[PDB]
Design a protein around this ligand. Sequence first.
Ligand SMILES: Nc1ncnc2c1c(-c1ccc(Oc3ccccc3)cc1)nn2[C@@H]1CCCN(C(=O)C2CC2)C1
Length: 265
Amino acid sequence: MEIDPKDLTFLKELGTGQFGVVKYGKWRGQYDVAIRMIREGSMSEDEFIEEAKVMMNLSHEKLVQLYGVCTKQRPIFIITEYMANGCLLNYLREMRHRFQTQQLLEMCKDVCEAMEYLESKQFLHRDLAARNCLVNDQGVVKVSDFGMTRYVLDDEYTSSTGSKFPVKWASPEVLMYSKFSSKSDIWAFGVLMWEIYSLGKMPYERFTNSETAEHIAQGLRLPRPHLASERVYTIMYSCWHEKADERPSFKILLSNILDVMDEES
Ligand SMILES: Nc1ncnc2c1c(-c1ccc(Oc3ccccc3)cc1)nn2[C@@H]1CCCN(C(=O)C2CC2)C1
């Protein structure tokens, strides 16, 4: 819903992100919130606003809840749930030896649940990666920056050959056909699981983007992480089938995850 800045407070700077500056603050006094001030010239604003209204109506425990926006001024403000531990990539790296495989599988269950809810709303992420996931005060992982890439103006960020495109999270049909689907979000989720169990290593760290794309096209798949059991690897590997229809939905994935977690008890 629209928010009157009268009801917001700026209390601390959290840093500038990929899609504009972000600050920590309080909404209506009692609500811990993270206020993003969108950059200017980066997004198709009207379209972006309408999609913001759609992502505002999305609610789920494992989705960074969106509380509102301030759009009748510029820069647009986006008021979101405050995730105290920041991006999942750095949470993974700072607490590298501070994790047990039970916690890793939990973070994957968290993400998979959020993506199964996004799947059921016919809403695509288009850029699922650890750098777009956040961690709260209790250690739970939640997805964020979902659907943001549909409205980015920089063609480097959007085109298949753009210098900033996340090829290393992209399915073959996204690199070759630009055919984003829930199956491409599933491929990306597979890569994300690999990030988690790798404790935040860059997939295909030393391959150039082109080299990665071609290797993927010819059958290359990420190596089983050291911290991944053969069952976890089987699960993240099923996301990376060459044929899109052969990949399991997020629901079937969540079921497999809970079966393995139960057997990991
Ligand atoms: N909420 C938050 N809490 C805490 N830090 C947050 C954030 C957001 C954020 C704000 C608004 C959002 O708007 C959305 C939400 C969902 C979908 C689309 C847009 C989505 C995310 N960004 N940052 C930080 C910003 C700079 C770098 N960061 C670090 O941690 C540094 C230590 C590495 C993360």
